[PDB]
């Protein structure tokens, strides 16, 4: 694409600069370019990719929620109906969000996932695939909320199956996957019991494995465990 003429190493370097500058749209474009070079990504590079798109889509999701809220309020009884603008603008943001999700899913399908041989890489990408189908699910309504939801579920499930076979219970990727799949169950699949069960089992199995960790690994794992606890506190 537009990044075809830039060196891979230069794209990675610029993604890092863009992160420092809080220029996440640029960071995402640089990392898209890097992926499209066709080489596998290192752990650091996978993190850059995920941080970039998480920030971009995060902004879009926040905006969509504000707009959807206004739209809902404008459509109720006992105030005023004031034209197509709120719907139009929510739709515009929605379409842009869907576009970013499709871009990320495109990168994962062509060809990050299939080239990911190791557990750490494959679980990371399948978690991402689950996440970006989840974001699509958040805004879906028509002939396709169900198929989108199933696509999220399938990706998360495959990731979970690999993670349980190949990674210890404290592995941050395994923990983050479980955190997000738990949120999928609560917020998307209307499965709050599955959400709570998953968060609790993940937390407890991690607790029991903390003794094997260095101080630094401990810090990383416990950070995500706290997020599991935060969610459980919200839900129970």
């Amino acid at each position: 694409g537009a990044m075809g003429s830039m060196e891979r190493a230069s794209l990675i370097q610029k993604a890092k600069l863009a992160e420092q500058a809080e220029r996440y749209e640029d960071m995402a474009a640089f990392m898209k370019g890097a992926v499209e070079k066709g080489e596998e990504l290192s752990c650091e590079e996978r993190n850059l990719l995920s941080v970039a798109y998480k920030n971009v889509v995060g902004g879009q999701r926040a905006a969509w929620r504000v707009l959807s809220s206004i739209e809902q309020k404008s459509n109720e009884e006992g105030s005023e109906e004031k034209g197509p603008e709120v719907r139009e603008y929510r739709e515009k943001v929605e379409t842009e969000l869907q576009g970013v999700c499709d871009t990320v899913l495109g990168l994962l399908d062509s060809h990050l996932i299939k080239e990911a041989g190791d557990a750490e890489s494959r679980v990371f990408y399948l978690k991402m695939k689950g996440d970006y189908y989840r974001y699509l699910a958040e805004v879906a309504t028509g002939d396709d909320k169900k198929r989108i939801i199933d696509s999220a579920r399938s990706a998360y499930q495959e990731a979970m199956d690999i993670s349980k076979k190949e990674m210890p219970p404290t592995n941050p990727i395994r923990l983050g996957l479980a955190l997000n799949f738990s949120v999928f169950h609560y917020e998307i699949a209307n499965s709050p019991e599955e959400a709570i069960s998953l968060a609790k089992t993940t937390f407890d199995e991690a607790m029991a494995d903390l003794h094997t960790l260095s101080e630094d690994s401990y810090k990383d794992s416990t950070l995500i465990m706290q997020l599991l606890r935060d969610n459980l506190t919200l839900w129970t």
Binding site: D131, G176, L179, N180, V183, E187, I224, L227, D230, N231
Partner: peptide, 5 residues
């Protein structure tokens, strides 16, 4: 809203 990473 719940935490994700």
């Amino acid at each position: 809203f719940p935490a994700t990473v």
